Paper text:
[name] (MCPyV) is a human double-stranded DNA tumor virus. MCPyV cell entry is unique among members of the polyomavirus family as it requires the engagement of two types of glycans, sialylated oligosaccharides and sulfated glycosaminoglycans (GAGs). On the virus side, PyV-receptor interactions are mediated entirely by the major [name], which forms the capsid outer layer. [name] assembles into 72 pentameric capsomers, giving rise to small capsids of 45 to 50 nm in diameter.
Using the fVLP preparation, we solved crystallographic and cryo-EM structures of the outer ([name]-only) MCPyV capsid. The structures have 3.5-Å and 3.4-Å resolutions, with no significant differences between them. Overall, six [name] conformations can be distinguished within the capsid, five from a local capsomer and one from a neighboring strict capsomer, previously annotated with the Greek letters α′, α″, β, β′, γ, and α, respectively. This asymmetric unit of six [name] chains is sufficient to reconstruct the whole capsid by applying 60-fold icosahedral symmetry. In MCPyV, we observed clear density for five out of potentially six disulfide bridges that connect individual [name] chains within the strict and local pentamers, respectively, i.e., for the α-α, α′-α″, α″-β, β-β′, and γ-α′ linkages. The MCPyV cryo-EM data further support the presence of this intrapentameric disulfide bond pattern; nonetheless, only the α-α connection is clearly visible in the electrostatic potential map. On the other hand, the MCPyV [name] sequence harbors a 37-amino-acid (aa) C-terminal extension with unknown function and no detectable homology. Neither in the crystallographic electron density nor in the cryo-EM map was this extension visible. Instead, the most-C-terminal residue resolved in either map is Val388γ (from the so-called γ-chain [see below for an explanation of the chain annotation]), meaning that a stretch of 35 amino acids is completely invisible and thus most likely flexible. However, it is clear from the electron density and electron potential maps that the missing extension must be located on the exterior of the capsid.
Numbering used by the authors:
A (entry chain A): 20 to 378
B (entry chain C), D (entry chain B): 319 to 371
C (entry chain B): 20 to 53
């Protein structure tokens, strides 16, 4: 019948497919909204719950205590670490007449800590009491939060609290620090920040928290939100809800574009000490939830596809070592660019900076 | 044609108008400015903003 | 801007950048000279 | 002008799009492929099907 008699029901964008990981193989229309959600367990030195000699202290640390004899040597599973994921995104139709294509773009990440009501577990067979015949003091102290979504892996300025530390060598997959990302001995410049120590993040539980922060310089394609609240017995606070939406859109309306169709989720939620009754202390992370709401949108490709493939064929594109013409302390002095035409300047050696006239 | 504007030129000489500083090196060899980008005009949206040329 | 009340000079290709190695990244026109 | 056609070039690079297989030798000196014809259009009936062009 006519729409005047049947009652009007407001419109909602309908749900096409619901399920696990293999939903993403579906082909959608030109305009669609994917709402992929995911969690990740917090790697905290103890990477997997299957080693039987060390499985009781999963998502904890060991006795994280000062040594007392210079210098320190912390264990591989004594120091905390980040964690990184990657959901796989499908192919999606490109174009060749306009040199345009489609990429996935996140718009509003939603988050919540899912392990938050386990923090009030005061009864435990090792928690140090507040006083005689008391309850143990519940989990508090050092609080830390950092989550990061983006199309590229997030990058980091490595600065250690002191250069005298000796992190273990990463013969196997181990804790990659600023010592093993350059090869030199850790200079005392690295207590402040340093521009020639800029590692990337591509392993789980192998890039520790205690050696760096995320860099705010190179991560233009990945946003991140962080916090800290430190102190020995300070109270932690956390609010969790189901109606907060963090908008990811930048100043110019762009989003965090999936570069190689990757959606790097990176988190670490180390929060609190639990006091062992012998006096030992241990850091305890909690797993983080996510809800990314990827949306298809158009783009023009950065690079020409023609000249790009010629770099692979070694008969067609050669590469020699030679003498250094790039980077630091190279042997190229002046580069001019001539474009267009105008009237004659006063000399062909114009200096542009204002201050250097007395020198 | 005159290469240098005369009005910006005379501000460079006085220590009041052009203040000099014994500050941390931002111009030189060891300097700490990392990524100076300059924008101009408008164009179509590039694929990733860290365009490796 | 009056041509008859102001002298004229020759036409010379305009300088756009003078500097180190890290200025080859400049997006130029269709007809430049490097 | 690019002398290399890119669509003829890009397929030769991938292992999944173009699979290479370690079979029995089908070109060279010891080729086991014996006789290959090709047909294009249709003319009138030839003298005998054993003729070779």
């Amino acid at each position: 019948p006519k729409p005047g008699c049947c009652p009007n029901v407001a419109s909602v964008p309908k749900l096409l497919v619901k399920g696990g990981v293999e939903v993403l193989s579906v082909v959608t229309g030109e305009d669609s909204i994917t709402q992929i959600e995911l969690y990740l367990n917090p790697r905290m030195g103890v990477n997997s719950p299957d080693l039987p000699t060390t499985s009781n202290w999963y998502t904890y640390t060991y006795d994280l205590q000062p040594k007392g004899s210079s210098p320190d040597q912390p264990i591989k599973e004594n120091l905390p670490a980040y964690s990184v994921a990657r959901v796989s995104l499908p192919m999606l139709n490109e174009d060749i007449t306009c040199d345009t294509l489609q990429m996935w773009e996140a718009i509003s990440v939603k988050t919540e800590v899912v392990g938050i009501s386990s923090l009030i577990n005061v009864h435990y067979w090792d928690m140090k009491r507040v006083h005689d015949y008391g309850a143990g003091i519940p989990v508090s102290g050092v609080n830390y939060h950092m989550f990061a979504i983006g199309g590229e892996p997030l990058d980091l300025q490595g600065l250690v609290l002191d250069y005298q530390t000796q992190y273990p060598k990463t013969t196997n997959g181990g804790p990659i620090t600023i010592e093993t990302v350059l090869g030199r001995k850790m200079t005392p410049k690295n207590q402040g920040l340093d521009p020639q120590a800029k590692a990337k993040l591509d392993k789980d539980g192998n890039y520790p928290i205690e050696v760096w922060c995320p860099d705010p310089s190179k991560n233009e394609n990945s946003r991140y939100y962080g916090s800290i609240q430190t102190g020995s017995q300070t109270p932690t606070v956390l609010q969790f809800s189901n109606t907060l939406t963090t908008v990811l859109l930048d100043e110019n309306g762009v989003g965090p574009l999936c570069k190689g169709d990757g959606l790097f989720i990176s988190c670490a939620d180390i929060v609190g000490f639990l006091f062992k009754t012998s006096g030992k202390m241990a850091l305890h992370g909690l797993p983080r939830y996510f809800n990314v709401t990827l949306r298809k949108r158009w783009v023009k490709n950065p690079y020409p596809v023609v000249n790009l493939i010629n770099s692979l064929f070694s008969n067609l594109m050669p590469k020699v070592s030679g003498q250094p013409m790039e980077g630091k302390d190279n042997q190229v002095e002046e580069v001019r660019i001539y474009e267009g035409s105008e009237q004659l300047p006063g000399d062909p050696d114009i200096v542009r900076f204002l201050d250097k006239f007395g020198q």
